[PDB]
Write a protein that binds this ligand. Structure first.
Ligand SMILES: [Mg+2]
Ligand SMILES: [Mg+2]
Ligand SMILES: [Mg+2]
Ligand SMILES: [Mg+2]
Ligand SMILES: [Mg+2]
Ligand SMILES: [Mg+2]
Ligand SMILES: [Mg+2]
Ligand SMILES: [Mg+2]
Ligand SMILES: [Mg+2]
Ligand SMILES: [Mg+2]
Ligand SMILES: [Mg+2]
Ligand SMILES: [Mg+2]
Ligand SMILES: [Mg+2]
Ligand SMILES: [Mg+2]
Ligand SMILES: [Mg+2]
Ligand SMILES: [Mg+2]
Ligand SMILES: [Zn+2]
Lengths: 63, 214, 25, 127, 97
RNA sequence: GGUGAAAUUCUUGGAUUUAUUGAAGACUAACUACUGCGAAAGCAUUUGCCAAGGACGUUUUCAUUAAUCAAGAACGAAAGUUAGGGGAUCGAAGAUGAUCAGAUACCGUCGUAGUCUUAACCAUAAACUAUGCCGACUAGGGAUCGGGUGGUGUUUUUUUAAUGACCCACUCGGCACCUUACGAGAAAUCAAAGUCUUUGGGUUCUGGGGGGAGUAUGGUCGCAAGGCUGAAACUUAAAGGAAUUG
RNA sequence: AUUAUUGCUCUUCAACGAGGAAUUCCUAGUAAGCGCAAGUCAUCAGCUUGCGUUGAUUACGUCCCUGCCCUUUGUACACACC
């Protein structure tokens, strides 16, 4: 299993009409200089560590 | 209690000569049963394929072509020129607002009595160093341009039937020469023969039909 | 009531008095 | 390389159609639509059933004699909407993902040098 | 009283033009008084570029979009699309975006 | 299939979907815009024929020949009428499936008349710019259509031109937009709705509180439906306009 | 004090095995769990107003439902959409 860890770089805002999901751009500490944006679930801040499973499927807006 | 899949006598489509690959594709027919077989029954199916496909190059990624099946032998059936038509999206992109369109056509006969009609489309060019946001023609000048397109178009044909016609279209001398006679009158850009429909093809002449089969 | 229909309304009545008057010839 | 076919996706509203045929056309090969993979009248154009029918299409497609296919998508056209439908590209998604090749595609929506007066009345379709 | 200098919509020196219908509700409505959205869109969409290139031949392909004129009828043109509404001065502005 | 959801419906009559070919009648997409032309209605595929028009250019010609108009007349959308064709489309009535308490509707289906054309009627539209016509004067701006004048301006190469498109300046006559407001107005707004109590360029038409009523009557016009002309009795203190605040 | 004001002791030993569709309250000594005093009161608290005791989980957000406020807009309403 190729789980890959990526650190929060910036907090971009809350998407989803409910307002729980948070748009955040991350960079993995598995070969740096490779930014990909993801959408979380729970509460977060800058410099946390998200376990991104698939390494090429990013998101943006929700509804 | 049927399934015509395990029954479909297969077949392969070949392309004409004056192009690139003479190998088109694959099809589906039937078992050549006595009285209405897979022989002279179907045949004349026709295929639409871009010629950026059958030529391989990409500077021809619109000019779609329609090929008609004529003769068939040895698990192989060829095809002759039957149509050439542009693509919806291409013109939909071509027709931009704030400019004058120009359309013309004409009915014509080749040497080998292949009767058809050809078309032509063009748009006034916004010359550089220009101020006016739009640039329209002068109708009378549009009369002129259509006239010359008519002259030139009826000049290029009556020449060695399909073969030579395709030989004049593929490298588009027509477009560049319309462009040539044009710029004297009014700017004008794009300029495509766009479409040409067959309507009265002659007889079989199997021998002369084998004129693009090596 | 709408001006158009009141126009139609009288056009009709007018067409009826027409008929009634015709009885008197 | 593979073997060329034509997909033909007439997917205007209310339903969603797919069927590969011979590149000449006179020989069709498998079809199925969206109203088959659910039943609810109201749900006959939804992208879901479109995916499912694209599945049931690619299935028999790669199970008879074609493993690749050019597509031509079409809205109602004529004197109607002309704008593509719900399960328009929703079926296109699940016939490229379903492991079948694609080779240049266009739009066969029948736009007229318009006429034959549209339905509805000069006063529209008020409701 | 009157509340539009172009009356309904642009037409000055005609008296008649030519009516057309509504792509939504089919309501007949003059061309000059219509409302036009040049509708353009790729055949694909959001996350379908990947499944195009990955599941097709060719180098980069080409990807041909579609153009089509969108005609609406003031009533349907207010029902959703280009409208909102504007203040007395916010009304004279012929600025699109 | 159809819509919000449904049904009416169509389906060994292989329906929806596909390919190939043919016919019929409408129609002229995109290009199509504060763009053109016509007295108005109105008028966008192509080519030919037919007669016409404005603006311009003009050291041509006549020399007051003109302006506006009761009567009178030409054309005049859509429907509608008569007699033929035509009859794809869409589609007043009518029949229907739903819908609601009812639903003679709105939505769906069937679909007559109609839509198209020829010969003749009809003469009305919010036929609108809700704004008579000719002439004068009164204020800045960049647009843009047509004509013209100007250039050791641009882009076109053949050897420099000649054409052609384009750039710029100017002036006619245009479709309009912008800012102003001297001035006007009850205001909204108006380069005319301005140069009106400091009240007069020429001329045509209409209106005189609301309702009764465009009714009755007569005349006249039309095949009809209807068109033009068009009162009164009685009734009533308001109707009405533009703006303001809720 | 019967139709049993309340309190006591024995005996009798129900339904309720976590509760449909729906729906109330709430962000820190708060929620919830726990009892007391006070009002009423001759007698009667499963109520109420307060009080302290033990003491979490989850947000720190958004406009999807709902409710409301604000603008533009229409108005023939102003006894003001009953
Ligand atoms: Mg009698
Ligand atoms: Mg109003
Ligand atoms: Mg008019
Ligand atoms: Mg055209
Ligand atoms: Mg009919
Ligand atoms: Mg009825
Ligand atoms: Mg009825
Ligand atoms: Mg009148
Ligand atoms: Mg008007
Ligand atoms: Mg001026
Ligand atoms: Mg009377
Ligand atoms: Mg009489
Ligand atoms: Mg519980
Ligand atoms: Mg107590
Ligand atoms: Mg109490
Ligand atoms: Mg107001
Ligand atoms: Zn509409």
């Amino acid at each position: 299993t190729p789980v890959t860890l990526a650190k929060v770089i910036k907090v971009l805002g809350r998407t989803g009409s409910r307002g729980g999901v948070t748009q955040v751009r991350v960079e993995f500490l598995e070969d740096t200089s490779r930014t990909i944006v993801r959408n979380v679930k729970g509460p977060v801040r800058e410099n946390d560590i998200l376990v991104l499973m698939e390494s090429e499927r990013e998101a943006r807006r929700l509804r | 209690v049927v399934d015509p899949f395990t029954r479909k006598e297969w077949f392969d489509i070949k392309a004409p000569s004056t192009f690139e690959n003479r190998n088109v594709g694959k099809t589906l027919v039937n078992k050549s049963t006595g009285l209405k077989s897979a022989s002279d029954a179907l045949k004349g199916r026709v295929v639409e394929v871009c010629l950026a496909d059958l030529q391989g190059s990409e500077d021809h990624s619109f000019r779609k072509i329609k090929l008609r099946v004529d003769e068939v032998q040895g698990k192989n059936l060829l095809t002759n020129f039957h149509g050439m038509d542009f693509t919806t999206d291409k013109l939909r992109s071509m027709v931009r607002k704030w400019q004058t369109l120009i359309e013309a056509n004409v009915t014509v006969k080749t040497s080998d009595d292949y009767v058809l009609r050809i078309f032509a489309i063009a748009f006034t060019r916004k010359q550089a160093n220009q101020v006016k946001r739009h640039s329209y023609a002068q109708s009378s000048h549009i009369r002129a341009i259509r006239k010359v397109i008519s002259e030139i178009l009826t000049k290029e044909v009556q020449g060695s039937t399909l073969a030579q016609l395709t030989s004049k279209l593929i490298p588009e001398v027509i477009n560049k020469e319309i462009e040539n006679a044009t710029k004297d009158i009014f700017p004008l850009q794009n300029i495509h023969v766009r479409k040409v429909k067959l309507l009265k093809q002659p007889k079989f002449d199997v021998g002369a039909l084998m004129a693009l089969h090596g | 009531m709408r001006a158009k229909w009141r126009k139609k309304r009288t056009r009709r009545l007018k067409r009826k008095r027409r008929k009634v008057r015709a009885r008197s010839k | 390389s593979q073997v060329f076919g034509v997909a033909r996706i007439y997917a205007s509203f209310n339903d969603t159609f797919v069927h590969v045929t011979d590149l000449s056309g006179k020989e069709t090969i498998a079809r199925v639509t969206g109203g088959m993979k659910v039943k609810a009248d109201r749900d006959e154009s939804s992208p879901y059933a479109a995916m499912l029918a694209a599945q049931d299409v690619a299935a028999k497609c790669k199970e008879v004699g074609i493993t690749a296919v050019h597509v031509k998508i079409r809205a109602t056209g004529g004197t109607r909407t002309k704008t593509p439908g719900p399960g328009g590209q929703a079926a296109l998604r699940a016939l490229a993902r379903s492991g079948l090749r694609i080779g240049r595609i266009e739009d066969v929506t029948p736009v007229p040098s318009d006429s034959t007066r549209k339905k509805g009345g000069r006063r529209g379709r008020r409701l | 009283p009157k509340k539009r200098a172009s009356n309904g919509r642009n037409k000055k020196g005609r008296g008649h033009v030519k009516p057309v219908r509504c792509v939504n509700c089919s309501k007949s409505i003059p061309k000059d008084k219509a409302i036009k959205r040049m509708a353009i869109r790729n055949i694909v969409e959001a996350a379908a570029v990947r499944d195009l290139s990955e599941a097709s031949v060719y180098p980069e392909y080409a990807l041909p979009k579609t153009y089509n004129k969108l005609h609406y009828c003031v009533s349907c043109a207010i029902h959703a699309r280009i409208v909102r509404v504007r203040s007395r001065e916010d009304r004279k502005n012929r600025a699109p975006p």
